[PDB]
PDB file of C-alpha atoms in Angstrom:
ATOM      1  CA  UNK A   2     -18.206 -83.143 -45.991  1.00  0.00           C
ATOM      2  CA  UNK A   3     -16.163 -82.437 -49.414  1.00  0.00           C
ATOM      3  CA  UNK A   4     -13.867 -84.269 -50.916  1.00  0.00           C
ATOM      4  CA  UNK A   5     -11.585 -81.798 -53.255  1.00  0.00           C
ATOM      5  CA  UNK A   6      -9.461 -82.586 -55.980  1.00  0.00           C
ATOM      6  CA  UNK A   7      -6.961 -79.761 -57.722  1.00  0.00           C
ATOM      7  CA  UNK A   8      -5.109 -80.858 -60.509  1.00  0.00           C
ATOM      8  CA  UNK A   9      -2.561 -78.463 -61.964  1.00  0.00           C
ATOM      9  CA  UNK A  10      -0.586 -78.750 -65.002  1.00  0.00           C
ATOM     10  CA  UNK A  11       1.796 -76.242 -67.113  1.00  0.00           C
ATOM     11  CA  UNK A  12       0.312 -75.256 -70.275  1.00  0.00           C
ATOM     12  CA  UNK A  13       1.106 -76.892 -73.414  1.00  0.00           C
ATOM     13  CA  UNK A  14       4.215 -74.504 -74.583  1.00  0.00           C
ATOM     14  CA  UNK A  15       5.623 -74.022 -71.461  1.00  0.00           C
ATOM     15  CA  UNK A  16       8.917 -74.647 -69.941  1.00  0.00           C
ATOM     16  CA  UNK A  17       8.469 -78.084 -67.603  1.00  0.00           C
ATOM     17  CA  UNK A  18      12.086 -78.345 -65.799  1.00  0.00           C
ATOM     18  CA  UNK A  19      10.905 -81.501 -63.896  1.00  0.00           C
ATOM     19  CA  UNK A  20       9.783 -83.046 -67.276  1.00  0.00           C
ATOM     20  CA  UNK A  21      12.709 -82.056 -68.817  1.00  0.00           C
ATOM     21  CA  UNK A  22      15.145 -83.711 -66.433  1.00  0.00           C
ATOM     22  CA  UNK A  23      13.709 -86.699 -66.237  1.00  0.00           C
ATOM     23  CA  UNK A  24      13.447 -87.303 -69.788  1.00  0.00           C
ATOM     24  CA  UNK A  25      16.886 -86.700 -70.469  1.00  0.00           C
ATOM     25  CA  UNK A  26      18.011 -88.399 -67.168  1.00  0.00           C
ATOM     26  CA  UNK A  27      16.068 -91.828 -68.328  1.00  0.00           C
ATOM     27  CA  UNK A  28      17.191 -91.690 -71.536  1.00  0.00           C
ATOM     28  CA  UNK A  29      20.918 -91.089 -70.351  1.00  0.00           C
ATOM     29  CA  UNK A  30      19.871 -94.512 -68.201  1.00  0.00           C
ATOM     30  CA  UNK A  31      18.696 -96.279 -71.402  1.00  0.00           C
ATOM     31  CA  UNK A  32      15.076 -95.727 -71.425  1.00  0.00           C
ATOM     32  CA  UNK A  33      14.033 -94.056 -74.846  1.00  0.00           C
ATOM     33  CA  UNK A  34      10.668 -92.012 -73.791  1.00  0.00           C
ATOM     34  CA  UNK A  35       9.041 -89.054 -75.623  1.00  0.00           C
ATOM     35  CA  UNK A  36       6.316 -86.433 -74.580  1.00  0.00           C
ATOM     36  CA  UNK A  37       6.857 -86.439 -70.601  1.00  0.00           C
ATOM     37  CA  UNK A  38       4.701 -84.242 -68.634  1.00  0.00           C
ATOM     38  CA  UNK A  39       3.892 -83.959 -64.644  1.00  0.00           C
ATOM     39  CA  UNK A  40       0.751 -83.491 -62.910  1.00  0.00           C
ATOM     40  CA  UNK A  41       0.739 -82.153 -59.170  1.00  0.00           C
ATOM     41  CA  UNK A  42      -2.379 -82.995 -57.733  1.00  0.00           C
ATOM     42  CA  UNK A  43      -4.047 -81.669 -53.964  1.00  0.00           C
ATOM     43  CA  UNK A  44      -6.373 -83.219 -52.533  1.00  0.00           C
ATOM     44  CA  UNK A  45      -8.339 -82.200 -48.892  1.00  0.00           C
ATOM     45  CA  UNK A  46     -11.513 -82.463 -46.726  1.00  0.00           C
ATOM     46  CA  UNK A  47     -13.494 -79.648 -46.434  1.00  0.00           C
ATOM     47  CA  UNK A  48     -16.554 -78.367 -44.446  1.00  0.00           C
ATOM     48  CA  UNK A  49     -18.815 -76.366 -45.558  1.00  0.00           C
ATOM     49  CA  UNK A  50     -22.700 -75.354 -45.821  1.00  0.00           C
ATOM     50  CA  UNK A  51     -22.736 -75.910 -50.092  1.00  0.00           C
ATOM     51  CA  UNK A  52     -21.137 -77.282 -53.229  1.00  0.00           C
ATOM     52  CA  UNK A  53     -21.433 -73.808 -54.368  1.00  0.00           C
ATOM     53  CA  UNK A  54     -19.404 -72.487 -51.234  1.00  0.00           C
ATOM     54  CA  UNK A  55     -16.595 -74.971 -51.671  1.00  0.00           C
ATOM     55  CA  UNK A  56     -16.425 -74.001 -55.544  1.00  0.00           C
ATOM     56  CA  UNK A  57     -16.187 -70.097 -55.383  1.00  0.00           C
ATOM     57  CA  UNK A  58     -13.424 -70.876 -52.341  1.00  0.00           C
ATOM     58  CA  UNK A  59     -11.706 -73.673 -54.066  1.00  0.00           C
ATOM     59  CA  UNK A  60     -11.411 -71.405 -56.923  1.00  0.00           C
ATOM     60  CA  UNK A  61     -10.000 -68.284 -55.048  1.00  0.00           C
ATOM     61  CA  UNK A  62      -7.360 -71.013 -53.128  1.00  0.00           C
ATOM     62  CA  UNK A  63      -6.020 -71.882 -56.691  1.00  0.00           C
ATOM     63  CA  UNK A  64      -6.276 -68.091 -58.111  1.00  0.00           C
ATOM     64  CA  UNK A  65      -4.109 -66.849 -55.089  1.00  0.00           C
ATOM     65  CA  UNK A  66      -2.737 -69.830 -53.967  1.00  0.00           C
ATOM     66  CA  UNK A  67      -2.151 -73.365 -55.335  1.00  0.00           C
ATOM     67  CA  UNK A  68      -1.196 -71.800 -58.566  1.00  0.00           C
ATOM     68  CA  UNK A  69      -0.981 -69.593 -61.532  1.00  0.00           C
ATOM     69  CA  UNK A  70      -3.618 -69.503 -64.148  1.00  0.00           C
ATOM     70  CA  UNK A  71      -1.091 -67.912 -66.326  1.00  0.00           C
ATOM     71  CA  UNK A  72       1.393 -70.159 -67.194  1.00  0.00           C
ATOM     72  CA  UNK A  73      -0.704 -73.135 -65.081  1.00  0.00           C
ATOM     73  CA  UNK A  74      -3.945 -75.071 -66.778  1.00  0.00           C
ATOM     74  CA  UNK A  75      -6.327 -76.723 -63.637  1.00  0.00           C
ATOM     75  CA  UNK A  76      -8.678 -79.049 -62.690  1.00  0.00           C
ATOM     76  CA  UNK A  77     -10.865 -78.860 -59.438  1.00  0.00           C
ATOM     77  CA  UNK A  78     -13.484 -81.711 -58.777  1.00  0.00           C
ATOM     78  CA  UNK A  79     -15.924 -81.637 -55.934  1.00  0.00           C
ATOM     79  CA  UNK A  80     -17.223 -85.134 -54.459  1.00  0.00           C
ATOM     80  CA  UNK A  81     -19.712 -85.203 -51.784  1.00  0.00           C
ATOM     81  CA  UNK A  82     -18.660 -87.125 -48.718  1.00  0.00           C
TER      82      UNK A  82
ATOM     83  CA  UNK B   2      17.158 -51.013 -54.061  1.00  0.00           C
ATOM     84  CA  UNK B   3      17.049 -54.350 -51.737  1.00  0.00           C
ATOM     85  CA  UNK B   4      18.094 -57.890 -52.877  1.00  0.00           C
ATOM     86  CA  UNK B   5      17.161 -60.582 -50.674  1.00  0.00           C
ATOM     87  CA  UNK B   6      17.702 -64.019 -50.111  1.00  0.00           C
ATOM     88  CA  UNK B   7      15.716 -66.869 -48.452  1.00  0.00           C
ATOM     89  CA  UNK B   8      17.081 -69.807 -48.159  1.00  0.00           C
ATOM     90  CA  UNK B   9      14.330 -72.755 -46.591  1.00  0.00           C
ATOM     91  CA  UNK B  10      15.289 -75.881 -44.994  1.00  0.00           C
ATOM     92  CA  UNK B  11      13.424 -78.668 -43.237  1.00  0.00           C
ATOM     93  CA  UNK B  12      14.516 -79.260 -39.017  1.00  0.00           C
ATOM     94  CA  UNK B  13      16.594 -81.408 -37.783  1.00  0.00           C
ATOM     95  CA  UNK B  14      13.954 -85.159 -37.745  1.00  0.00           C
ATOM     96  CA  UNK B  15      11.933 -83.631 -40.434  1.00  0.00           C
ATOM     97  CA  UNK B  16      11.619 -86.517 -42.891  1.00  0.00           C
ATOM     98  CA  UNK B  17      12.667 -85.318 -46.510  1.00  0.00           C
ATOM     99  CA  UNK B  18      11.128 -87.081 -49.352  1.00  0.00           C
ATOM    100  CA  UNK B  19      13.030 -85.677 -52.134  1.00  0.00           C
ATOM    101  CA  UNK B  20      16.728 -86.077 -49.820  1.00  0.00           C
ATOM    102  CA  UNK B  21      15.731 -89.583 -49.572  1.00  0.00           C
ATOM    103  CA  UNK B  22      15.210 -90.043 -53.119  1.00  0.00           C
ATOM    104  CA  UNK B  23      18.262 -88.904 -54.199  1.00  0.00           C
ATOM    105  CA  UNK B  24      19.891 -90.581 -51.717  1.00  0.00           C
ATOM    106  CA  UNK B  25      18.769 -93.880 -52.876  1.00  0.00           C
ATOM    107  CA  UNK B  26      18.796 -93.320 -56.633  1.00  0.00           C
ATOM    108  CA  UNK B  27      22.267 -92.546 -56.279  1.00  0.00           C
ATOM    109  CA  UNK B  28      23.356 -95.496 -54.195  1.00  0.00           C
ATOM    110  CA  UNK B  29      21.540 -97.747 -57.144  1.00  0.00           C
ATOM    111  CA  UNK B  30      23.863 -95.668 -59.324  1.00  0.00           C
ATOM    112  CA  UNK B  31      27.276 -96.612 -57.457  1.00  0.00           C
ATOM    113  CA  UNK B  32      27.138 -93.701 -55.450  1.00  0.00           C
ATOM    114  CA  UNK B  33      27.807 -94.050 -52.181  1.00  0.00           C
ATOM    115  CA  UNK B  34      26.619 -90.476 -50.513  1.00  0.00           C
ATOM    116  CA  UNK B  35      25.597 -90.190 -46.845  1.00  0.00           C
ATOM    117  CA  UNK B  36      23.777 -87.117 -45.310  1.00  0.00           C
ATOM    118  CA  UNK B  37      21.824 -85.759 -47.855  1.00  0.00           C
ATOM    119  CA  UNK B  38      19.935 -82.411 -47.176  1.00  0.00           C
ATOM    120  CA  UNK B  39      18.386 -79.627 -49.617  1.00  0.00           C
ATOM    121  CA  UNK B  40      17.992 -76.080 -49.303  1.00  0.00           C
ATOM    122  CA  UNK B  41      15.788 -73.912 -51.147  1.00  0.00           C
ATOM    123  CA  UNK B  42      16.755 -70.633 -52.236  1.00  0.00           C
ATOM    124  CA  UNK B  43      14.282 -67.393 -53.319  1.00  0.00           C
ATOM    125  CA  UNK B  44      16.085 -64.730 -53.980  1.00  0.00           C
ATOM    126  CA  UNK B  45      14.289 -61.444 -55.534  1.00  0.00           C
ATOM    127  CA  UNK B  46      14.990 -57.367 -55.439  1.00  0.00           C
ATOM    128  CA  UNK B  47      12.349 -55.041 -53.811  1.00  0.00           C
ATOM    129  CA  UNK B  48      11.622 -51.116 -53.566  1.00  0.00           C
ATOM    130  CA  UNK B  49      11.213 -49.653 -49.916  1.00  0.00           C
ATOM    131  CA  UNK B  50      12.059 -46.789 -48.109  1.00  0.00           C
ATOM    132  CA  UNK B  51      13.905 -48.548 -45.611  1.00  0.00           C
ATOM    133  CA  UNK B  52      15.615 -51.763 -44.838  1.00  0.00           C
ATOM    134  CA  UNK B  53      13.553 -52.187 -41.946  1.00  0.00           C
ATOM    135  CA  UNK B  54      10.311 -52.059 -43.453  1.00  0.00           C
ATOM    136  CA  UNK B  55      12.024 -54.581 -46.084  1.00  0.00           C
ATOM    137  CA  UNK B  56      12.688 -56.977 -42.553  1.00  0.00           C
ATOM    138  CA  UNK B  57       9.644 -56.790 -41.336  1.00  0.00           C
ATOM    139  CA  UNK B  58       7.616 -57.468 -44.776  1.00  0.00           C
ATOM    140  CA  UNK B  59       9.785 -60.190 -45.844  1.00  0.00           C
ATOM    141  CA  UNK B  60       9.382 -62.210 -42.228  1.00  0.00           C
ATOM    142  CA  UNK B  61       5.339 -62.287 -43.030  1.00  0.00           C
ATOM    143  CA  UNK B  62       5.690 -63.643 -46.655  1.00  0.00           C
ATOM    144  CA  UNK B  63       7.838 -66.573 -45.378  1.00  0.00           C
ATOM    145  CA  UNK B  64       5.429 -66.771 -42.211  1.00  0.00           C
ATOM    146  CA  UNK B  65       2.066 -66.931 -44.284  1.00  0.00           C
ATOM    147  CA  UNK B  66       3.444 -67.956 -48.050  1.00  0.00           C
ATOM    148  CA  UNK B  67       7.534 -68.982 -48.413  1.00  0.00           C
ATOM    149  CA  UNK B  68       7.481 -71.469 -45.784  1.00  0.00           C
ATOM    150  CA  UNK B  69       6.203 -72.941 -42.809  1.00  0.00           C
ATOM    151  CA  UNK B  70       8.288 -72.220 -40.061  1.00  0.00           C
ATOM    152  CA  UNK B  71       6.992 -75.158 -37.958  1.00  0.00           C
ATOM    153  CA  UNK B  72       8.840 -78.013 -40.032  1.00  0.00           C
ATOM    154  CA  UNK B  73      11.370 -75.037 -41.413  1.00  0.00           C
ATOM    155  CA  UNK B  74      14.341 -73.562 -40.288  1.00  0.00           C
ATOM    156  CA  UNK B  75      14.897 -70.147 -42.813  1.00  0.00           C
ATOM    157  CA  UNK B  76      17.243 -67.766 -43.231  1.00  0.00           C
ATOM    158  CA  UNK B  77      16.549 -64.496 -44.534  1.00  0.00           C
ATOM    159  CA  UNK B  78      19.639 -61.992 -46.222  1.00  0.00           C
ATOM    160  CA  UNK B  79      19.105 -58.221 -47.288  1.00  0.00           C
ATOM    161  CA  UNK B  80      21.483 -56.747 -49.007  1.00  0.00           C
ATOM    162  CA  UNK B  81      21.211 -52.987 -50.186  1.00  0.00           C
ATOM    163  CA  UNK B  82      21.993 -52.519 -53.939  1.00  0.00           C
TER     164      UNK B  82
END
């Protein structure tokens, strides 16, 4: 029935390992690249009765789940199947 | 007062995305390394009153939260401090 989308992203100031080591790993390999950031997106099917359903759940899964508001900045989108 | 240790690895079969990366990346580098495998390691202190209450509550977070045991072999230390 719903077609859910969770992006999740570290916000701007914080530590990104990942990022980190890849940047420095490409340039090591010759590849001069600035700003590098990573995205982890989740996507699922879901059934439900509502939209509104799916959005007050969605939004508990990434509260106590998917990830932390705290150091984490998210997207969830909701498409209709 | 307890410091344990978790370490998580995928079975025996279990394809491993990041393994297989590395694997490749390297070989592209001039490496030539066979068998590649991760582990991941949580390791964190915790208050109880006894080290079996520490057992038991440590085997549900890596049954519903660390884990899942049905791709992951774990292994689960607790040493008193």
């Amino acid at each position: 029935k719903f077609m859910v989308e969770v992006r999740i992203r570290l916000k701007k100031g914080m530590l990104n390992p990942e990022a980190a080591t890849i940047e420095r790993a490409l340039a090591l390999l010759g590849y001069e690249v600035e700003d590098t950031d990573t995205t982890d997106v989740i996507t699922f099917t879901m059934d439900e009765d509502s939209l509104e359903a799916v959005e007050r759940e969605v939004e508990d899964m990434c509260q106590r789940l998917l990830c932390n508001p705290v150091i984490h900045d998210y997207d969830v989108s909701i498409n209709e199947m």
